[PDB]
Amino acid sequence: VYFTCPLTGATLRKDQRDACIKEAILLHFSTDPVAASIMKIYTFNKDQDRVKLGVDTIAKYLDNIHLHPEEEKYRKIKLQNKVFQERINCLEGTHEFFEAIGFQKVLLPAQDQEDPEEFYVLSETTLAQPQSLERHKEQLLAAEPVRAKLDRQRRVFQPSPLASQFELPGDFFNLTAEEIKREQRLRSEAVERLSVLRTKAMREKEEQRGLRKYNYTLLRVRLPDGCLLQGTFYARERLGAVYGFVREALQSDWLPFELLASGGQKLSEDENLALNECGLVPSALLTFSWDMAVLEDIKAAGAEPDSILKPELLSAIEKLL
Amino acid sequence: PNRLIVDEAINEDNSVVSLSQPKMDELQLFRGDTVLLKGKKRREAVCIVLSDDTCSDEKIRMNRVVRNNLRVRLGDVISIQPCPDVKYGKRIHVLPIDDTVEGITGNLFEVYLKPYFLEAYRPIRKGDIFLVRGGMRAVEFKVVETDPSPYCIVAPDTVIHCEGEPIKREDEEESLNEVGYDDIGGCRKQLAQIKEMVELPLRHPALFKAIGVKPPRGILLYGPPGTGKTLIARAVANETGAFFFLINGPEIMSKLAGESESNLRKAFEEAEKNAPAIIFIDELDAIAPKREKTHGEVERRIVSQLLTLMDGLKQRAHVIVMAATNRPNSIDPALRRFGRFDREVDIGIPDATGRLEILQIHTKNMKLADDVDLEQVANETHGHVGADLAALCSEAALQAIRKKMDLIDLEDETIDAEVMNSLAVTMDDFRWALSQSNPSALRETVVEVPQVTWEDIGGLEDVKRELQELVQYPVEHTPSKGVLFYGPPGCGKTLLAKAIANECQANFISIKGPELLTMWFGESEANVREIFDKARQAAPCVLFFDELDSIAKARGGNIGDGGGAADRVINQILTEMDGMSTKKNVFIIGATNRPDIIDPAILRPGRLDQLIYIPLPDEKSRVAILKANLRKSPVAKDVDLEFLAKMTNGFSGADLTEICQRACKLAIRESIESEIVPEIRRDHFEEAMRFARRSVSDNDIRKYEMFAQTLQ
Amino acid sequence: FISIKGPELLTMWFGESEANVREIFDKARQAAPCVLFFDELDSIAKARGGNIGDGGGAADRVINQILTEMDGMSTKKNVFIIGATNRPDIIDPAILRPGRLDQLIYIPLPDEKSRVAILKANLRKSPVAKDVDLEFLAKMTNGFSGADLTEICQRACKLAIRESIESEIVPEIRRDHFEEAMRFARRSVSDNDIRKYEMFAQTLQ
Ligand SMILES: Nc1ncnc2c1ncn2[C@@H]1O[C@H](COP(=O)(O)OP(=O)(O)O)[C@@H](O)[C@H]1O
Ligand SMILES: Nc1ncnc2c1ncn2[C@@H]1O[C@H](COP(=O)(O)OP(=O)(O)O)[C@@H](O)[C@H]1O
């Protein structure tokens, strides 16, 4: 499965996504330190519940000094505060954000301890104009993690009749000693499994072995003109993204059509179901047909519907062998 | 490479096969892609491939229609070759097979071919034979012309033509209406046992020809009439290809001396000539009754001739003899000696699940109305066997036929297909047929998986765990093979045995006092051997001996007659228990309410080594019991079950049930009286408590506690 | 050695097939030299009620046929008869008369020195680590029978084997295997059963 890195445009595999995006965010600090630290807070940290609490606690510190900009006790954010330590100090990228939006990291004597404590102290340049922090606060709170976009890898194929021409050896149908002994052992084991007296826990331990193999799917569409349209989808993707994918591939993206699933169930564009709920994962072929309303006009006008896809995709058609 | 062993289908559809996903990934084909299957005699078939969670990695699942087109059988190997180049067809010419279009006329396309292919996009190859069901007939068609070649996918724009006379079936083509494995409903385990014993020597005869060790010479199928004894024998022969020879008692016994024995041995000679072959002898007890029952020369001589013919099977290679009887003890015991008919299978009576499957089989060709609920029918048809469910479906169809045909008024040799197409069997027609049908196996014991679950038992949290450990430990890792339950009545002894059987999906055999007493009273304790033999055949099962002291009590209990704690039946039970191993997948549970008068032999090492006390429920358990009993009814929020449980300190689980049932009855009465309220109110429980009493006294609890401490 | 079990004596009575008693003694005559062992001699008295029963004695069809065959068996055929029961108080006294099973031997639960001997004997087939304290185990298993002491040693053997097999995915049974075995082993004979046997033995003087 292939993805596009949102910050670079690079082509990556499923395992290479975090490595490239993280590097792009760390380099982005040379253009916009605030935007880079915002991406770093949401992207690097896997625990999004803590990230949401972290950025909300940062927003409160910024509004506190906004309400009382003349009081020095709101100008310094203590890094050892119970709420700061749990929500902000535990996340990667939160320190870079404070520096990016005008806070200096300093050590100040404590009111009751000899050891100096860590503070983020807002400079006079930014404190004089609260509008800067107010914009940076909204830029952090409205942000999302950076994740590589799934590459559809839109391709059209033309099957070659040569792939179906093959003859078997004369001994093909003569089974070996291992194949015959294995089959008889499976018959004896199947009778034994039906005879075994076991609890539900033992039954589930065996059944559960088939539950974890797939999270992506490859879909193909068989078109009336003999062409095959293929693309890549996430297991949780909705049926509406498949209709949008096909519409982009069609010569006429506006012309009504239906997609029929391999089990005989018609998939409607208005049905917001996931591909792993409709039985289209890890792979499936869909059957393409135009709506009957337009087919009646096409036939009545004497027009042969000899082209389904746009020439922009067909010029790159590959053969299947 | 790219070749799998042919197995049975799960999806009955004729255009699809199922693979295990890892093989579809190696073949680089997707769910719904069209593939070719390469079979024997340079034949091929085109179909759609899907996947499921049950197909073996090295097998392909396909139904009878696909196997016949490939001229292959279960256990063979075929090659899978994806063919994405298949295009949509323009014109396909399909004609019926004459063998299945007889007595029926009209427009077969509109009734059968059109809805079958319409928007189905089924792959079709020239020469294919496929089955379309409807109109209470099974009509199959052969494809004679395709504009594209040699195969295509039918589309809504494809012309479907059907002009010409029906096609006469070729001698190499088998009828799809012949009984096979897909026509057998319940008794799946028994069919699997026959496969293990029979399919190998028939599909791979060379494995037994090169060695001096013969395959099983005879299999005795026994059980009530109408359970599928003959159906299994025919299905196995038809699926493997072995020649099937039908013999029955009356056919041989009706013949005169000399002719009778000649016909019996002639059939055996024919089986050798047509080997591999299966010889099915029905009513074995009629052809070979016990000799001591008659002085006739013909009856003795026929038994002797059958005995020698069975022994001659060491020469008649690849011939297997199967026989059917009502009971294994109703036949001449000589047949069951080493060899001959030393292997037997108990077919039994289908349970609720099997009965539903049987009904679905008989309705294969039947058009049902939307209100028909075959699962509800299967639940009501207790005591019925497949022969009775076949009659049930036929009678329901005949009632529907009369209702509509009396409006059609067509008097001719054939009936139009459109008339049959519009005919449907509704719930009123099955309900009528149920009232007229009478089960043939109502007196025989029905053994099935119980429906009692752990949520139906209040309290006893530790006993639930103990039973799960006793069954789970010998499977996950000498373990005991039985437990005795003792304590006051009405605390869940029976439910515990059923609930563990339920969770294990094990058969539950319920033996009650009256059954133990009947065997004692009639001096028929020999039936205990059949009970334990049933427990083995029913494995996995829980064999529950309730009221173990019912005979000791009937003989006096506290006073006594000529006996004491032991009797005819208990001693035979002790005998059989010594012959049952922990590996037989049978868990024996006993119960008694009077442990002081029970034969102590049952608790000796090797038998009921586990001993569990079931006390009266405590306060939190009584609440759980009340909630379980009311789990199936609407209850108002004003009902305080915890307060009730606090009061009913001396009540057993059975006594708390009476309170719940009285409150339910009162709610029903009030609702009916108002119609002439929708939920059970506190007023109904307050009235119920006025009549309910504790059934277990304080002195009885002391009796049980003393026993518990005596044995520890 | 010919093993005759209670279920055979019980079936013969209920099925009115005492002729099978002759088959048992005839087999012993033909198998000679042999020891004909009649287990569960109490099964006949129990069949008549055992703990309750009627008001009569223990005499019945099966015991009468057995006693008849015993009287007709000569010691010159090299056939010796041994009986056993777990309920000696209800054995038909006729079988204890001169010419029958007149000799009575009491077999109690093993004592302190016997239990150690049993634990040691069961381990002759496997190496035993020096840290295994068999006398300590015998002291704890005061209420255990020889059958229960065997389970302890055999379970410890299985546990040592389990570890040995796993080590290749050990050369001897270690103290940990015996201490673990003690977690599952239980006594099969209760204190009330012991007193019943001791009181009977005392009654015989
Ligand atoms: N277990 C079963 N599954 C499906 N159908 C069954 C079963 N048992 C009986 N039948 C049906 O009942 C009839 C049995 O009649 P028959 O061929 O005489 O067999 P038998 O009398 O030996 O059961 C058939 O119509 C068969 O389809
Ligand atoms: N522990 C329990 N939990 C729930 N219901 C119980 C319990 N014990 C008894 N009952 C009620 O008593 C009825 C009879 O139980 P059953 O197990 O048949 O008693 P027994 O085993 O003494 O014949 C059941 O219908 C059930 O509703």
Author numbering:
A (entry chain H): 121 to 441
B (entry chain B): 23 to 499, 509 to 707, 728 to 763
C (entry chain C): 539 to 707, 728 to 763
Provide the authors' own sentences about this structure as they appear in the paper.
UBXD1 contains three conserved p97 interaction motifs: a VCP-interacting motif (VIM) helix and ubiquitin regulatory X (UBX) domain, which canonically interact with the NTD, and a PUB domain (peptide:N-glycanase and UBA-containing or UBX-containing proteins) that interacts with the C-terminal tail. Here we identify UBXD1 as a potent p97 ATPase inhibitor and report structures of intact human p97–UBXD1 complexes that reveal extensive UBXD1 contacts across p97 and an asymmetric remodeling of the hexamer.
Two additional states were identified, termed p97–UBXD1meta and p97–UBXD1para, in which densities for the VIM, PUB, lariat and UBX are also observed at other positions (across P2–P3 or P3–P4, respectively) in the p97 hexamer in conformations similar to p97–UBXD1closed, indicating that other configurations can occur. Additional UBXD1 molecules may transiently bind p97; however, opening of the hexamer at one site would probably displace other molecules because of steric interactions and conformational changes across the ring.
